[PDB]
Amino acid sequence: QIITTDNTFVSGNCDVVIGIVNNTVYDPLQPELDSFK
Amino acid sequence: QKLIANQFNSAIGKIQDSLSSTPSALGKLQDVVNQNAQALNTLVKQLSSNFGAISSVLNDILSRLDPPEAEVQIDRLITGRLQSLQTYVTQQLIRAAEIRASANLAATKMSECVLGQSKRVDFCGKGYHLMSFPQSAPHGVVFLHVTYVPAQEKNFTTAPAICHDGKAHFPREGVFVSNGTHWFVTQRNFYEPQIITTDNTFVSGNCDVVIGIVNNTVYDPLQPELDSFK
Amino acid sequence: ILPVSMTKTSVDCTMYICGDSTECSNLLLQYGSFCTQLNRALTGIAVEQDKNTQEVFAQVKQIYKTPPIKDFGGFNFSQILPDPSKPSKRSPIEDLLFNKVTLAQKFNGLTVLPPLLTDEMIAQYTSALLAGTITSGWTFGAGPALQIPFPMQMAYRFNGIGVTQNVLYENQKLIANQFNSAIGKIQDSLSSTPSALGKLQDVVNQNAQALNTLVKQLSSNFGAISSVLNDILSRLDPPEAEVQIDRLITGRLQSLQTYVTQQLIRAAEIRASANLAATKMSECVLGQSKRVDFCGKGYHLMSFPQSAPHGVVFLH
Amino acid sequence: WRVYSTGSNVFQTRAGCLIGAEHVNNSYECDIPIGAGICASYQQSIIAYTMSLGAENSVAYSNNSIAIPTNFTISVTTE
Numbered sequence: 117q118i119i120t121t122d123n124t125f126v127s128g129n130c131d132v133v134i135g136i137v138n139n140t141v142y143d144p145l146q147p148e149l150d151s152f153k
Numbered sequence: 154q155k156l157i158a159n160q161f162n163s164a165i166g167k168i169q170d171s172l173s174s175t176p177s178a179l180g181k182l183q184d185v186v187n188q189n190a191q192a193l194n195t196l197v198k199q200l201s202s203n204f205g206a207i208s209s210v211l212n213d214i215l216s217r218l219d220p221p222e223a224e225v226q227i228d229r230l231i232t233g234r235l236q237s238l239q240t241y242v243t244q245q246l247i248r249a250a251e252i253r254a255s256a257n258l259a260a261t262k263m264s265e266c267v268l269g270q271s272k273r274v275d276f277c278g279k280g281y282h283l284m285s286f287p288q289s290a291p292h293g294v295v296f297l298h299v300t301y302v303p304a305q306e307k308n309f310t311t312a313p314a315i316c317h318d319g320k321a322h323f324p325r326e327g328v329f330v331s332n333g334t335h336w337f338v339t340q341r342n343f344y345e346p347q348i349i350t351t352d353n354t355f356v357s358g359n360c361d362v363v364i365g366i367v368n369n370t371v372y373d374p375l376q377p378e379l380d381s382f383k
Numbered sequence: 384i385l386p387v388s389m390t391k392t393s394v395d396c397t398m399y400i401c402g403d404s405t406e407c408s409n410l411l412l413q414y415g416s417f418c419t420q421l422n423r424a425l426t427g428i429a430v431e432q433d434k435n436t437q438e439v440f441a442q443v444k445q446i447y448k449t450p451p452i453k454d455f456g457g458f459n460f461s462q463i464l465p466d467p468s469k470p471s472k473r474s475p476i477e478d479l480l481f482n483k484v485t486l487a488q489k490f491n492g493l494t495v496l497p498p499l500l501t502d503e504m505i506a507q508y509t510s511a512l513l514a515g516t517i518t519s520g521w522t523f524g525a526g527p528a529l530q531i532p533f534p535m536q537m538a539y540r541f542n543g544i545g546v547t548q549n550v551l552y553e554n555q556k557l558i559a560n561q562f563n564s565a566i567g568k569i570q571d572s573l574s575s576t577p578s579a580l581g582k583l584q585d586v587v588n589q590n591a592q593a594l595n596t597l598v599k600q601l602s603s604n605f606g607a608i609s610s611v612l613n614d615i616l617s618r619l620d621p622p623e624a625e626v627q628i629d630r631l632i633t634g635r636l637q638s639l640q641t642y643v644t645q646q647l648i649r650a651a652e653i654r655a656s657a658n659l660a661a662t663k664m665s666e667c668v669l670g671q672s673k674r675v676d677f678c679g680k681g682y683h684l685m686s687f688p689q690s691a692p693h694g695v696v697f698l699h
Numbered sequence: 700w701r702v703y704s705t706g707s708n709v710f711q712t713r714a715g716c717l718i719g720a721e722h723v724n725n726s727y728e729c730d731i732p733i734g735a736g737i738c739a740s741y742q743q744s745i746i747a748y749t750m751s752l753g754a755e756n757s758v759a760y761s762n763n764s765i766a767i768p769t770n771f772t773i774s775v776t777t778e
């Protein structure tokens with residue numbers, strides 16, 4: 117499944133965890149809020 | 154909380170009367186005590202048995218056949234008594250093994266039920282297990298398993314999944330149930346229907362694949378807020 | 384495969400040892416409680432066998448019955464549910480198991496009490512458990528039975544092992560076909576080798592061997608001039624034949640003591656296995672187990688019990 | 700030991716000869732275990748019957764019906 121902020125939770129900055137890798141994470145709320153406000 | 158407290162208090166009360174009235178409730182301990190006492194008594198009672206000798210009293214042998222021949226009667230009595238002691242010790246060893254198995258089971262029950270919560274469905278009494286309390290007994294341990302027994306079920310008609318704009322919605326936790334005209338999602342062990350939302354469910358695949366889908370609308374909590382601010 | 388019980392044997396210690404001879408019975412009485420203690424121990428292990436079956440099978444307060452309109456979402460339990468066609472209510476795999484185990488006759492002193500629960504009743508209990516775990520999932524083992532459509536029940540069992548629901552429904556046909564193929568393969572798997580039922584047949588063989596050794600011991604003499612008491616009484620007058628009779632008494636009683644000790648040890652072993660079978664019946668079929676190897680090689684779903692002569696057969 | 704040789708109450712079972720207890724066609728739960736699935740119980744008489752393994756209960760089942768509880772009951776069980 118494509119990564120979203122719904123099936124993913126947040127903790128801390130990007131330095132403390134080894135093996136961290138960059139990528140984008142889709143947001144299911146931003147496009148609609150931008151479209152309609 | 155009030156109802157749970159009242160039910161728990163009533164049960165903890167009634168268990169006392171359950172133990173008091175029934176005359177055979179504690180049979181598993183009385184069996185052990187009776188078996189041990191009976192084995193000891195039948196050991197002692199065997200002391201007066203003859204084992205094929207002119208007498209069963211020791212001193213009488215020493216005053217009725219003279220040392221040259223009374224040794225034979227003494228030997229016969231010795232063999233008989235030693236055999237009886239052998240049988241008693243072997244019975245005790247087997248019973249001690251049985252009690253060791255029971256005590257290991259009791260230790261496992263203490264560790265799992267009392268010190269935690271066990272998902273083993275029928276390890277701690279009928280019903281799902283909530284907690285337990287131990288109680289000492291003269292030659293054993295008495296538990297008080299506190300179990301959650303559901304009751305007062307009622308019929309509903311379900312579908313494995315909900316179709317809405319062709320996307321197969323499934324319940325995140327629980328199961329879809331219908332009261333006849335509407336649809337609801339509920340925790341699987343209690344009837345607390347909640348309106349179906351995109352947060353209560355999740356999606357996968359599409360319509361055509363699942364076997365028992367039904368048609369319904371799925372609420373979307375973002376829509377009212379977005380429409381409030383156009 | 385798990386054994387749960389062995390044949391309930393009993394021996395008439397006095398009649399066995401003395402062999403109808405009244406004077407020998409009078410002489411043996413001097414020994415005291417040996418002949419009562421042996422009988423009591425044999426009775427004690429005899430009752431425990433009924434206890435084992437009642438503990439393993441009677442896990443349910445009611446006798447459930449599977450519905451007539453069989454629509455289990457494509458799953459086909461024909462090979463596991465009871466078969467109406469046979470004179471007995473045994474299921475096909477149960478029938479194969481009953482055929483695969485074969486033989487305790489009338490002797491001097493020995494007797495074999497019938498089990499408290501006949502094969503028909505045990506098959507009925509197993510059918511009750513099977514219908515309960517088919518229609519109601521796991522609820523019926525911990526309260527009043529709640530019906531639930533079987534495909535949905537399996538969908539929730541998947542959710543119990545970390546695989547989301549939607550993997551089942553989108554693959555229901557494949558799951559059904561695999562399950563039916565495996566269930567159908569169990570029959571020929573059992574029929575393939577005589578060694579499949581090794582435990583139950585071994586239990587029966589060991590019991591028969593112990594009984595035969597106990598009976599065959601009579602042909603021995605333990606240092607006496609003969610094995611038959613009538614010969615002893617014919618050859619010697621009572622004051623001299625008493626020693627020979629005592630010799631035979633000690634020998635036969637020692638043999639009986641050895642047999643009873645062996646039976647006690649085997650009773651402890653089989654009762655341990657019956658407690659294990661009871662734990663498996665409570666945990667696997669009535670529910671689901673997170674014990675990663677307690678219920679078959681792999682992640683676990685619901686099981687089905689089956690009755691076998693002197694044991695159970697689980698389909699994990 | 701000619702006592703209990705009456706012919707009005709002599710019965711035969713797979714568990715053995717049973718004397719005195721009157722046989723009945725009904726069925727009940729276990730009270731006293733005779734062998735081979737027969738149990739004897741008191742009633743102004745003694746009766747011996749074939750075992751009943753619990754009242755029959757059939758779960759209404761279909762491909763689209765569920766049943767979820769609407770209440771609970773706590774309970775305590777000794778062991």
Ligand SMILES: *[C@@H]1O[C@H](CO)[C@@H](O[C@@H]2O[C@H](CO)[C@@H](O)[C@H](O)[C@H]2NC(C)=O)[C@H](O)[C@H]1NC(C)=O
Pocket residue numbers: 137138
């Ligand atoms: C992943 O993203 C982080 C954050 O943007 C990158 O870290 C920066 O990399 C640039 C490379 O020119 C440096 O100049 C910065 O100093 C880094 N830190 C920050 C805070 O910007 C990182 O390079 C990216 N790639 C990987 C493989 O980690």
Ligand SMILES: *[C@@H]1O[C@H](CO)[C@@H](O[C@@H]2O[C@H](CO)[C@@H](O)[C@H](O)[C@H]2NC(C)=O)[C@H](O)[C@H]1NC(C)=O
Pocket residue numbers: 332333334335
């Ligand atoms: C099934 O549930 C629905 C839920 O919508 C019930 O319909 C509601 O009933 C209440 C009763 O006070 C009304 O106030 C609502 O207005 C009804 N909903 C709508 C949309 O009008 C329905 O009564 C329930 N039926 C059964 C048999 O349980």
Ligand SMILES: *[C@@H]1O[C@H](CO)[C@@H](O[C@@H]2O[C@H](CO)[C@@H](O)[C@H](O)[C@H]2NC(C)=O)[C@H](O)[C@H]1NC(C)=O
Pocket residue numbers: 364365454762763
């Ligand atoms: C459950 O079984 C019933 C009856 O076997 C099925 O009902 C049929 O469903 C089809 C497809 O929707 C209809 O065309 C028929 O008219 C229905 N017949 C009857 C008598 O109801 C039902 O589809 C089954 N549902 C599931 C999920 O298996």
Ligand SMILES: *[C@@H]1O[C@H](CO)[C@@H](O[C@@H]2O[C@H](CO)[C@@H](O)[C@H](O)[C@H]2NC(C)=O)[C@H](O)[C@H]1NC(C)=O
Pocket residue numbers: 367368
């Ligand atoms: C559930 O809804 C779907 C979509 O509205 C129905 O499928 C449509 O059925 C009509 C029947 O005239 C067809 O004309 C459409 O082409 C169908 N569309 C799709 C996408 O399949 C479906 O019949 C409904 N089923 C039930 C049980 O209500």
Ligand SMILES: *[C@@H]1O[C@H](CO)[C@@H](O[C@@H]2O[C@H](CO)[C@@H](O)[C@H](O)[C@H]2NC(C)=O)[C@H](O)[C@H]1NC(C)=O
Pocket residue numbers: 459460461462
């Ligand atoms: C479920 O499995 C049973 C297997 O016992 C199938 O019964 C067979 O059906 C075919 C066709 O009717 C017969 O030729 C066989 O003799 C049957 N028995 C066996 C052992 O193969 C049954 O058809 C399957 N399906 C259903 C719906 O019951």
Ligand SMILES: *[C@@H]1O[C@H](CO)[C@@H](O[C@@H]2O[C@H](CO)[C@@H](O)[C@H](O)[C@H]2NC(C)=O)[C@H](O)[C@H]1NC(C)=O
Pocket residue numbers: 557560561564
């Ligand atoms: C997953 O594995 C199963 C086999 O365990 C596959 O099912 C087989 O699929 C082939 C090709 O479609 C058929 O010829 C066989 O008859 C199928 N066997 C059974 C028992 O169904 C299944 O296709 C695999 N899944 C995927 C996505 O490849």
Ligand SMILES: *[C@@H]1O[C@H](CO)[C@@H](O[C@@H]2O[C@H](CO)[C@@H](O)[C@H](O)[C@H]2NC(C)=O)[C@H](O)[C@H]1NC(C)=O
Pocket residue numbers: 156159160769770771772
């Ligand atoms: C769940 O069951 C309990 C009883 O086990 C119900 O509690 C009773 O409720 C009635 C009506 O309010 C009272 O008159 C009784 O005194 C209560 N019993 C006890 C022991 O407190 C409870 O109402 C049930 N829940 C529902 C939703 O019906």
Ligand SMILES: *[C@@H]1O[C@H](CO)[C@@H](O)[C@H](O)[C@H]1NC(C)=O
Pocket residue numbers: 134135136
């Ligand atoms: C271990 O992982 C790091 C990145 O997470 C990588 O740079 C490194 O090469 C890895 N080590 C080995 C032995 O693969």
Ligand SMILES: *[C@@H]1O[C@H](CO)[C@@H](O)[C@H](O)[C@H]1NC(C)=O
Pocket residue numbers: 306307308759766
């Ligand atoms: C559901 O309805 C059927 C038919 O009316 C009934 O027999 C059954 O008892 C109901 N379910 C429950 C749990 O009572």
Ligand SMILES: *[C@@H]1O[C@H](CO)[C@@H](O)[C@H](O)[C@H]1NC(C)=O
Pocket residue numbers: 724
């Ligand atoms: C009881 O059942 C048997 C067998 O079905 C039958 O012969 C008999 O008439 C019935 N009634 C009585 C009183 O025995």
